[PDB]
Structures are given as structure tokens and as C-alpha cells.
Design an enzyme around this catalytic site. Structure first.
Site, PDB file in Angstrom:
ATOM      1  N   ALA A  35       3.665   9.593  -0.278  1.00 15.66           N
ATOM      2  CA  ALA A  35       2.330  10.268  -1.087  1.00 15.66           C
ATOM      3  C   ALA A  35       2.782  10.821  -2.280  1.00 15.66           C
ATOM      4  O   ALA A  35       3.068  12.027  -2.626  1.00 15.66           O
ATOM      5  CB  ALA A  35       1.855  11.441   0.001  1.00 15.66           C
ATOM      6  N   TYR A  69      -1.332   9.287  -4.769  1.00 16.45           N
ATOM      7  CA  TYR A  69      -1.391   8.744  -3.726  1.00 16.45           C
ATOM      8  C   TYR A  69      -1.526  10.074  -2.552  1.00 16.45           C
ATOM      9  O   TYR A  69      -1.824   9.874  -1.418  1.00 16.45           O
ATOM     10  CB  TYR A  69      -0.447   7.669  -3.249  1.00 16.45           C
ATOM     11  CG  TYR A  69      -0.836   6.290  -3.604  1.00 16.45           C
ATOM     12  CD1 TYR A  69      -0.627   5.196  -3.074  1.00 16.45           C
ATOM     13  CD2 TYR A  69      -0.928   6.172  -5.094  1.00 16.45           C
ATOM     14  CE1 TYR A  69      -0.992   4.202  -3.121  1.00 16.45           C
ATOM     15  CE2 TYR A  69      -1.311   4.780  -5.585  1.00 16.45           C
ATOM     16  CZ  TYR A  69      -1.084   3.690  -4.705  1.00 16.45           C
ATOM     17  OH  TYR A  69      -1.670   2.318  -5.106  1.00 16.45           O
ATOM     18  N   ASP A 111      -1.937   4.087   1.904  1.00 17.06           N
ATOM     19  CA  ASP A 111      -3.547   3.942   1.586  1.00 17.06           C
ATOM     20  C   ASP A 111      -3.972   3.138   2.539  1.00 17.06           C
ATOM     21  O   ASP A 111      -4.626   2.235   2.395  1.00 17.06           O
ATOM     22  CB  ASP A 111      -3.262   2.942   0.301  1.00 17.06           C
ATOM     23  CG  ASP A 111      -2.390   1.848   0.368  1.00 17.06           C
ATOM     24  OD1 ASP A 111      -1.399   1.847   1.083  1.00 17.06           O
ATOM     25  OD2 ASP A 111      -2.515   0.616  -0.259  1.00 17.06           O
ATOM     26  N   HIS A 170       2.013 -10.142   7.731  1.00 18.83           N
ATOM     27  CA  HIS A 170       1.152  -9.778   6.623  1.00 18.83           C
ATOM     28  C   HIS A 170       0.089 -10.594   6.728  1.00 18.83           C
ATOM     29  O   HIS A 170      -0.188 -11.669   6.989  1.00 18.83           O
ATOM     30  CB  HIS A 170       1.987 -10.174   5.148  1.00 18.83           C
ATOM     31  CG  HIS A 170       1.257 -10.107   3.887  1.00 18.83           C
ATOM     32  ND1 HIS A 170       0.009 -10.312   3.524  1.00 18.83           N
ATOM     33  CD2 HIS A 170       1.827  -9.187   2.693  1.00 18.83           C
ATOM     34  CE1 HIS A 170      -0.241  -9.822   2.386  1.00 18.83           C
ATOM     35  NE2 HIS A 170       0.857  -9.148   1.909  1.00 18.83           N
ATOM     36  N   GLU A 174       9.089  -5.489  -0.445  1.00 21.54           N
ATOM     37  CA  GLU A 174       8.935  -6.586   0.547  1.00 21.54           C
ATOM     38  C   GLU A 174       9.639  -7.733   0.533  1.00 21.54           C
ATOM     39  O   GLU A 174       9.986  -8.340   1.665  1.00 21.54           O
ATOM     40  CB  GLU A 174       7.430  -6.760   0.198  1.00 21.54           C
ATOM     41  CG  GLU A 174       6.896  -7.724   1.062  1.00 21.54           C
ATOM     42  CD  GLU A 174       5.223  -7.860   1.046  1.00 21.54           C
ATOM     43  OE1 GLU A 174       4.946  -8.698   0.112  1.00 21.54           O
ATOM     44  OE2 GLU A 174       4.591  -7.089   1.863  1.00 21.54           O
TER      45      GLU A 174
END
Ligand SMILES: CC(=O)N[C@H]1[C@@H](OP(=O)(O)OP(=O)(O)OC[C@H]2O[C@@H](n3cc(-c4ccc(C=O)s4)c(=O)[nH]c3=O)[C@H](O)[C@@H]2O)O[C@H](CO)[C@H](O)[C@@H]1O
Ligand SMILES: O=Cc1ccc(-c2cn([C@@H]3O[C@H](COP(=O)(O)OP(=O)(O)O)[C@@H](O)[C@H]3O)c(=O)[nH]c2=O)s1
Ligand SMILES: [Mn+2]
Ligand SMILES: [Mn+2]
Lengths: 288, 288
Positions: B65, B69, B156, B176, B246
Site C-alpha cells: 500500500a 494505494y 486494490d 489471470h 507478472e
């Protein structure tokens, strides 16, 4: 060895798995505790071979050939050479009361056989049941220092197709070919509460066959020790389980869930059961 | 702890698994390397809860965070209290550049939260990518002593349904939501051979989401260390992978196969992708 961590594979070319187009739609391929149930079409053996070879995996295979069952050894071993763990290190352990009767069988590279001389009990029930004690004892004497996994099978059998590293896991049982389609009330579990193998009618996942189980050496030692101990309690209490060692195996795997379950491809009797469509391969089968 | 051996369960009453009538026929529920793919209908959570509770399993949950965020933390944490590993020991780790901005959230018994103060990178690409280094560093500093498994997620997000011990395993990735039905040529892997994250068009099992991965502390330490090192090599070579951390996660899990894969129930964006019939539950989802 059994690697402490996930291994790193080299580049490989194979068909993409299809999330929305599963190959096996006719059978359950995972248990409710998320253990794979191993059927043809569920695994890519090239990926699994790489994983296990990178760990230099050694598989031990125990088999009991007591009294007249030494007759079965020749075909059992010759077919194992064609079909069992080819490409991996294998150590066969033949338990017998007749070392001189073990047939001379030519072995492929990285494969070895040891003959273990043992007592022959009078009753076939005791010959069958005492395997648990004998496997447990030898896990300490030999197996822990010599192999990574142990596979424990009946001798009156032959390999007809691939039996490979897809079966290996900390603890596995095999669906009995006579009961894979049956309801739990029909399973021939021990039903007398006086027996340590007791399982009531509202319990049971599968009926596992006594003729094919295995796992890591440490898990097989625990299972076989536990089954032997339970059999000894029953004996002291004047009771013998309806299906002997198989009954205790089933009580054990009920309370200690196996981390893979093998389909009846891995334990079949074609004379009694034919070749149903649901069996795409017959891998390990009864000899008349 | 993570138990060395299979645990012994008490008697349990639940529906018999049906070998010849699988619940999920519409999706792949096991990978070709025999890892379960976790969908609703594949698991009995009562069995799994028993297995994990008997080991007094502690689960760590990491979230970053950084900068603005921090605004996502209240909903993330309050919904995790309702849905994440309820009944088990949980340790939240909130990595942030603003310790004073972490909201007060009441936690259930056996659940605790640590705030880890870290640096905020100027580029959002680096904020996202540097998570790997930071997780790896704290594996050594804190996680190895404090938790058994680590679950590493985007902040998020909100939990909307059960996320529990069915996901725990040595190493897992998550499908995903944008690609679970796509061919591997359409996966947005890094395609430049010059990158450490390079995967060519004829390779790839799945496209895993960087927003949800995990495993045992030791496997997560190894994965995060390897992804950080690969990113550092890319940086030295003047290259940055198309989807950052990723892309590297995907390269890692291509070569080190995960022992479970989570279905997109565990990583979804309902605004973007709606709610396909194949998703019986939406468990962990994007916040606008
Ligand atoms: C293909 C199949 O379904 N096999 C099943 C079926 O096996 P099975 O009836 O063929 O049992 P077996 O005759 O093979 O006995 C088990 C193993 O124990 C070993 N054995 C067995 C025996 C005997 C067993 C019954 C005998 C009758 O007088 S002799 C023997 O004299 N010497 C010996 O070494 C040998 O390894 C043998 O394979 O039934 C058992 C339960 O008893 C299990 O359910 C098993 O899974
Ligand atoms: O302005 C563009 C940004 C893109 C990412 C940013 C960012 C991300 N993060 C963390 O990285 C995760 C991934 O970024 P993201 O959620 O924005 O990524 P996507 O969901 O778009 O893939 C977030 O969930 C946070 O945990 C932060 O903590 N602070 C941030 O400023 S800021
Ligand atoms: Mn037999
Ligand atoms: Mn996000």
C-alpha cells in the site's frame, strides 16, 4: 532423493492444457481433499519424468513370493522391466521363503534386485496380512537409506502398460477394480465395531485395493506399522478383519487421506471384469 | 507448522465422492503435472480445514500500500476478516511508505497485523516490480520465523467469498481472469528473447496473474528472489518486461510448475469481465 524444493525444468514443447476443454469428462480426476486421481489423459508423462529425473528419484518395489507364488515372479519381473518406472532408478525387493527359486531376470541399467528371506505362514490370510509387519520392519532395516519411494504390490500380476512416476507422492492408494463404481454402503469394509478396521456405513471415500499402495518411505513405514499394530490388537481381541490387511489399509487411508489415488487402470482383473470403456489402458493386471 | 507426515482425521460424515459422476465437467480441474486447479465443487472445505487446523497452520498475507494505494486498505482488510482463512491463524503484512495511514481494523482471534515501512519508488513500474525484492528480503527477516505459508496479493481488491486453506500448497499461481480461456499465442508473455522473462509462442501452460501467488515461505522466498534477480539482469541489459513482475512470475512458474493453480474465482474483475457461468463464486475481486 526427494528434493526439498520445486525443480527447474528445461524448455519443453507440448500441447497447451485447455482450461475450458478437459480431456476426462467421464470420471472424477480429483478427490474432495484435492488429491489427483490418476487416469490416462490426466497427465503429461514427459513433464513428470523431467521433474522426477531431476531429483534422481529411486523407486523401491516390494513383492511377496511365498510358497507356490514364486511361480509368478518371472512374468512379474520381466513385465516390470518393460513397463515400471523405465528411465528411473529401481530397486526390487523380493520377499520369499525360497531364495533359490527366484528366477534369473535380466535387468536394465540403474535397476537392481534384492532377495529378502522371510517366514512362510500356514494360513493364506496370515501370509497376506503379515506383509504389513514385514514391510514395516524392512523400512527400518533397508528402505529408508536405499530408496525415495516405496511401491507395494501383489505378485500374481503382470504389467501390460506404463506404470510410471505419475503415481509417486507422499501417500497413495489404488481404487479396487471391483468397487470403483460402488456406493460406500456396498464397500466390503470391516463392519464389526469390535475390530480396529471398523468403518460404519456413513463413512468412506473409496474402497482401496490391498494389492497396490505406496508413498514415500516414511509414509509407507507409518502406514504399514499402523496396520500391523491394528491387526495385533484385533488378534488379541479374538477377531480377524473380513478382508484382512486390505480392511486395515482402508481404515488407515480413511483417516489419513492419500495425496494421490490411482484409478483401476493400475489394478485390474480382465478375466473377472473385462475391459470397460472407462479404462483407456490396462496397466497392471491379474494373472489367472 | 507444516507437518512432516499425513495427519490423522477424526470420524467425519460427508457425501461420498462419486468416481463415475464428477461435479465439474465444464473445466479442467487438474494440470498435466497433476496439480489441482481449484474451482468451486472440487473440494470439501471441512476435510481440508481439519487437515490444516491439525497442523496449527499460520498463513501470512502480504499487501503493498504505497503512496495513494493506502486508500484500499480499509476494505481489503475488513473483507479479509470476513472471508480469508477464517478459523486459522493469519498474519497480515502491510508494506507501506505511510505507517500512520494504515486504518484501524478490528481483527478476529488468532489474527494479527504487522506494518512494514518501506521506500516508495517514483515509477509505478518499480513500485510493482520491487515487491519481489521486498517480499524476498522479509522472508529472511520475518516470515520464515512467523508463518507457514505466504499469500501475496494486490491491495486494490476485496474479498467477496471464501478464500481458505484449499489454496495452500508448496507453490501456487492463479489463472489471470483475462486469459483463462485463451490460446497460449494470445497470452501477453514477454516475447523479446533479450529478456529473462522471454517465453516463445510454442511454450506456456497458463497465464498467471501477478496479483495473487503464494506457497510455503521457502518456495515464495525462492520465487521472489528469482524474479527479482531476473528483473535486475533485465535492468542491466536495458530492458523492462512488458508486464513487469507478472512477466517474470510467468517465466518462473513455467519452469517451476506450481503444485496448485487457482481458478479465476480467486482473481476477478467483474466490471471488466462480467460473471461467466463457469464462475460459481467470485471470491477476490477488483475494486474500481
Ligand atoms: C487383482 C485384484 O483385484 N487383487 C485383489 C485380490 O487379490 P488376490 O485374491 O488375488 O490375493 P492373492 O492370492 O494374490 O494374495 C496376495 C498376495 O500375497 C502373496 N501370497 C499369497 C498367497 C496365498 C493367498 C491365497 C491363497 C489360497 O490358498 S495362497 C501365497 O500362498 N503366497 C503369497 O506370496 C502374493 O504376493 C499375493 O499376490 O483380493 C485381495 C484381498 O484378499 C485384494 O482385494 C486384491 O486387491
Ligand atoms: O499510476 C499508475 C500506478 C500503477 C501502480 C501503482 C501502485 C501500485 N501499488 C501496489 O502494486 C499493486 C499493483 O498495481 P495495480 O493494482 O495498480 O496493478 P493492476 O491491477 O493494474 O495490474 C497494487 O495493488 C498495490 O499493491 C502501490 O502500492 N502503489 C501504487 O502507486 S500507481
Ligand atoms: Mn493377487
Ligand atoms: Mn491491482
Amino acid at each position: 532423493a526427494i528434493g526439498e524444493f520445486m525443480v527447474s525444468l528445461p524448455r519443453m514443447v507440448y500441447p497447451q492444457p485447455k482450461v475450458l476443454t478437459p480431456c476426462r469428462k467421464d470420471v472424477l480426476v480429483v478427490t474432495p481433499w484435492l488429491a489427483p486421481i490418476v487416469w490416462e489423459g490426466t497427465f503429461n508423462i514427459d513433464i513428470l519424468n523431467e521433474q522426477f529425473r531431476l531429483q534422481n528419484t529411486t523407486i523401491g518395489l516390494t513383492v511377496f513370493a511365498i510358497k507356490k507364488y514364486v511361480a509368478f515372479l518371472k512374468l512379474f519381473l520381466e513385465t516390470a522391466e518393460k513397463h515400471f518406472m523405465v528411465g528411473h532408478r529401481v530397486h526390487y525387493y523380493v520377499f520369499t521363503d525360497q531364495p533359490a527359486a527366484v528366477p534369473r531376470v535380466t535387468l536394465g541399467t540403474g535397476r537392481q534386485l534384492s532377495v529378502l528371506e522371510v517366514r512362510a505362514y500356514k494360513r493364506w490370510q496370515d501370509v497376506s496380512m503379515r506383509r504389513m509387519e514385514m514391510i514395516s520392519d524392512f523400512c527400518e532395516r533397508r528402505f529408508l537409506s536405499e530408496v525415495d519411494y516405496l511401491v507395494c504390490v501383489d505378485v500374481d500380476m503382470e504389467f501390460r502398460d506404463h506404470v510410471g512416476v505419475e503415481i509417486l507422492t507422499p501417500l497413495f492408494g489404488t481404487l479396487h477394480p471391483g468397487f470403483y463404481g460402488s456406493s460406500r454402503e456396498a464397500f466390503t469394509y470391516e463392519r464389526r465395531p469390535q475390530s480396529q478396521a471398523y468403518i460404519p456405513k456413513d463413512e468412506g471415500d473409496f474402497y482401496y485395493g490391498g494389492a497396490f499402495f505406496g508413498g514415500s518411505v516414511q509414509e509407507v513405514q507409518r502406514l504399514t506399522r499402523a496396520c500391523h499394530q491394528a491387526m495385533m490388537v484385533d488378534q488379541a481381541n479374538g477377531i480377524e478383519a473380513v478382508w484382512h490387511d486390505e480392511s486395515h489399509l482402508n481404515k488407515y487411508l480413511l483417516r489419513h487421506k492419500p495425496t494421490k489415488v490411482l484409478s483401476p487402470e493400475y489394478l485390474w482383473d480382465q478375466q473377472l471384469l473385462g475391459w470397460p470403456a472407462v479404462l483407456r489402458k490396462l496397466r497392471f493386471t491379474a494373472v489367472p
